[PDB]
Design a protein around this ligand. Sequence first.
Ligand SMILES: CC(=O)N[C@H]1CN2CC[C@H](O)[C@@H]2[C@@H](O)[C@@H]1O
Length: 504
Amino acid sequence: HHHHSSGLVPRGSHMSQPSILPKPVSYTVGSGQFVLTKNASIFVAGNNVGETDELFNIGQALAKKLNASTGYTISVVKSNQPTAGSIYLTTVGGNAALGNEGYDLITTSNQVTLTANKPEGVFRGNQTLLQLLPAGIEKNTVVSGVQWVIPHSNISDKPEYEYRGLMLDVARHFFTVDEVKRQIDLASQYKINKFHMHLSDDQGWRIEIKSWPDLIEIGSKGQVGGGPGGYYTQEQFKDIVSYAAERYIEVIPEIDMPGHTNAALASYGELNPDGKRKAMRTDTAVGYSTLMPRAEITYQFVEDVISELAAISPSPYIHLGGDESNATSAADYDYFFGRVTAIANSYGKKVVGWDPSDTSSGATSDSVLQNWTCSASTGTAAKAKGMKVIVSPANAYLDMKYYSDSPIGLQWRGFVNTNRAYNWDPTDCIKGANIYGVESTLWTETFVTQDHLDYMLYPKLLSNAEVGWTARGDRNWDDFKERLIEHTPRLQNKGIKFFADPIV
Ligand SMILES: CC(=O)N[C@H]1CN2CC[C@H](O)[C@@H]2[C@@H](O)[C@@H]1O
């Protein structure tokens, strides 16, 4: 047999017909179609009234989306007796083998029926349902001239990995609450279920801490390259968390320590050995900053921050960073990371940290490693301790240039095009681990606008999303590439300023 790898498409990028991404466990099509008309309702039915009420909210979110493009006013009914032409969302009789996020989705001429185990799984299945309707459905304004049809079809589905996440760096360049919500919204449509916010770094501190007000008054006032910066009040952070929750997305806030801490060091002189504030930094260096690992003030500061953040962050996890502490000795890092893990745990939060944070003797088997290095020895400690691992290899570093000539992005992990973002498996990063799942990271040294975010995340994030959801035996670049071409009008329809990658 003969085999080949993909080159660029001759003559440039390529960027009744459902476009399902990530690819579901199974999808068959039969004869006939359902027609969504102006008289359609969404019926919801759970195993008790409280579950029905949660399904009702999910139905209303679906209706709002459908109404925007169809110009209809589809309403939601609490009943297990849907009428011909109805969409029906239920958790009564879910197939347990499909888990919390899994669902069956069967479309007949008279009815769309989504059957899941939990409300969360109906939310995920609704993302597939939007992809079964014609391109045009994902428009934010009324589309005319398109019959709203869904082919007679049968889908069953469930994720391969539990953790399928996106990190946004809001420290290097700040993005508004609206801009963050939009990225969360877009990601949710591809079954991303986790959002990691990198809220502090050398060039900016982005979360209001009432007990340490100069973190904002001084530390939020810049960004890479110099510029106004910005921050989230605690109310604005709660608003983000709530918006994410409606999409069954967990938000994990990161306060990076003991390195990548210049913004805090520039806000409070008492955090520095000489008692003086650092100057704020707008460059892109490079592992130089450290908290004082042997000063009690450091741990008082960390505790105040953790206390305030824990009070407003319902996720059982807090991310404490731990990357590139090059100005911290190995002994002091071990010590520091163990102490701050104990503080976090005292506030009822489990700690996620970048490698090498798993090597801290203060870590517990409840701590999580985010493995970005992905070398042979990375996560030896995590594995030995029974710690779950989230992988973020080069293939998930979405801030890398697509190509040598990309007008934005970095290149310290090489180039990451749409193909590279697809052709990998979490087991490539680490062997012998409990892999919790995958996280796409979008660092923002070089991204200043929403259009920059769109360009790098789309289509790359779609590749990573499939690696998290679709089983490896069912993944194939040639298949995905052709599906991505078909999906293009949908990206356009959503207003995504994607890069038309010439490898697609
Ligand atoms: C976990 C991680 O990727 N940390 C840093 C790794 N460095 C390497 C050089 C880049 O500035 C990049 C920076 O964007 C990231 O914040």
